[PDB]
């Protein structure tokens, strides 16, 4: 494990690292004032689907006070509707905090703010959820199945192996890889600068950027950490960047289904998922992407 890449490959890694640290609070300290849960048929097959999405997707919420208190929340099992949208207005507030932490992560990326405004928007829309999951995997724990997010601590609920859910299977598989923080931020650059996303005008620019980040990542693993049992790791990471788009796809259809029935999405969230120029249409994103205060 000795190190050594091109100077360009070195500056671009630390460009991400000091963009990650600059915009990602691993303690979620600045995340408060958020919402919390409370203290006509045959189309309903649509409803049956929504409940199916969530019934593998159960979590024990938990708030720690600065004292020693644990305000723990456990989820209601399902026998009906409206009980299921419990954490939904809370999660909607979490993402609004994560996503502007995503928008800012890209906002400070030099390559990113060099792309035109109507291209930054497009890159963020298709990478928002992708970026969220990779950030959440850093704070994910295997032998408890919880996302220790500072004061918040979203746990897991055994039922029978909900690895039958790929979403969960992702976080588990991505975690057994034991990635260095330098690799996480490269997967983010790779995910953020994907040229296939709907709206990417400057295709060649973004395409080149991705490849750069990709080889940088492989070379990182190749000449840093290369305990020769660490081959195939670029493969495993590649397999995860690939799975991250099944997960992205399937959870976008998920979100759509839910909002279809129960509208809860924040004016941000709607812009990030589509719920005429873009800047007129993504005015809150437009403002967040010109913002210097």
């Amino acid at each position: 494990g000795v190190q050594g890449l091109t100077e360009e490959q070195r500056m671009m890694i630390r460009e991400l690292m000091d963009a990650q640290m600059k915009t990602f609070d691993t303690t979620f300290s600045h995340f408060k004032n958020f919402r919390l849960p409370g203290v006509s048929r045959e189309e309903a097959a649509k409803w049956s689907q929504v409940r199916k999405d969530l019934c593998s997707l159960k979590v024990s919420l938990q708030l720690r006070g600065e004292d020693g208190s644990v305000w723990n929340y456990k989820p209601p099992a399902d026998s009906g509707g409206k009980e299921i949208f419990s954490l939904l207005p809370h999660m909607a507030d979490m993402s609004t905090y994560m996503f502007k932490g995503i928008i800012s992560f890209a906002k400070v990326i030099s390559y990113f703010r060099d792309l035109p405004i109507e291209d930054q928007i497009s890159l963020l829309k298709g990478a928002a959820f992708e970026l969220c999951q990779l950030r959440f995997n850093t704070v994910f724990n295997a032998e408890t199945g919880t996302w220790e997010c500072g004061r918040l601590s979203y746990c897991l609920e055994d039922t029978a192996q909900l690895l039958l859910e790929p979403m969960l299977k992702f976080h588990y598989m991505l975690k057994k890889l034991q990635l260095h923080e330098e690799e996480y931020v490269l997967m983010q650059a790779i995910s953020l600068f994907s040229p296939d996303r709907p709206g990417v005008l400057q295709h060649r620019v973004v395409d080149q950027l991705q490849e750069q980040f990709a080889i940088t990542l492989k070379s990182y693993i190749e000449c840093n950490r290369p305990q020769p049992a660490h081959r195939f790791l670029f493969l495993k990471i590649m397999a995860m960047l690939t799975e991250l788009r099944s997960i992205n796809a399937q959870h976008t259809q998920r979100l759509l289904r839910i909002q279809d029935i129960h509208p809860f999405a924040t004016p941000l969230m709607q812009e990030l998922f589509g719920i005429s120029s873009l800047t007129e249409r993504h005015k809150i994103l437009h403002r967040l992407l010109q913002e210097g205060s």
């Binding site: 296939d196 490849e211 080889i215 493969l235 590649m238 960047l241 690939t242 788009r245 796809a249």
Partner: protein
């Protein structure tokens, strides 16, 4: 040495013929193609099974392991194969039925965005980097050997086989293309691009299957229905 990069090429060559001379000479520089695309898909599914059987060690896997892999992978394995054929033509995509589809017959059939996506993301990149066939058979052998597929009797055998492909393609891509140092990576970089397109394709297959006004043949229908699979399960033991 245990997954010879030449045996992979043998498979690709045995199931894919040379570029047609009309295409090589003249190409490069209706009223629902969707039925034809589906027709091509069902045709290629029989080809796909014969392809995978030639790929080393795939036939010694448990019988229902081969099914799971082919089933999880068929959609992107066909997209890889038709995106590679289509670098021969100047525009559009070329199906294995010979039919040449355009982005007018694709835009007026609803499959506009996805088709253009395959163009600018798969065709336009396999062309510009001059993707050779041995690299295709290897990338496809990778997509095929996906151990993150549910039900696998021994996911660490499929793990091992993807590694041997990864290793062999690594050795080859160095040997054949030294001046291109990060070629092996940009090959793998196409994988998430292939998935995101592949899932948009099933998102179309399932949409046209739902309408019912899109004739779908036995094997393609056996791939779009939940596990079951008798054709697939039969072909593998032959």
């Amino acid at each position: 040495e245990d997954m010879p990069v030449e045996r992979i090429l043998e498979a690709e060559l045995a199931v894919e013929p040379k570029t047609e001379t009309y295409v090589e000479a003249n190409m490069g520089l209706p009223n629902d193609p969707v039925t034809n695309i589906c027709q091509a898909a069902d045709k290629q599914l029989f080809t796909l099974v014969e392809w995978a059987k030639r790929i080393p060690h795939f036939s010694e896997l448990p019988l229902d392991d081969q099914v799971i892999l082919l089933r999880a992978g068929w959609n992107e394995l066909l997209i890889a194969s038709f995106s590679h054929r289509s670098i021969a033509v100047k525009d559009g995509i070329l199906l294995a039925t010979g039919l040449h589809v355009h982005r007018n017959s694709a835009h007026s059939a609803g499959v506009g965005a996805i088709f253009d996506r395959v163009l600018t993301e798969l065709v336009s990149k396999m062309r510009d980097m001059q993707m050779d066939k041995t690299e295709l058979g290897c990338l496809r052998a990778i997509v095929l050997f996906n151990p993150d597929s549910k039900g696998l009797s021994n996911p660490a055998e499929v793990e091992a086989l993807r590694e041997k492909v990864y290793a062999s393609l690594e050795a080859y891509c160095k040997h054949k293309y030294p001046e291109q140092p990060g070629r092996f990576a940009k090959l793998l970089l196409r994988l998430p691009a292939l998935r995101s397109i592949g899932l948009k394709c099933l998102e179309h297959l399932f949409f046209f299957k739902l309408i019912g006004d899109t004739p779908i043949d036995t094997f393609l229908m056996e791939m779009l229905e939940a596990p079951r699979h008798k054709i697939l399960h039969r072909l593998l033991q032959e």
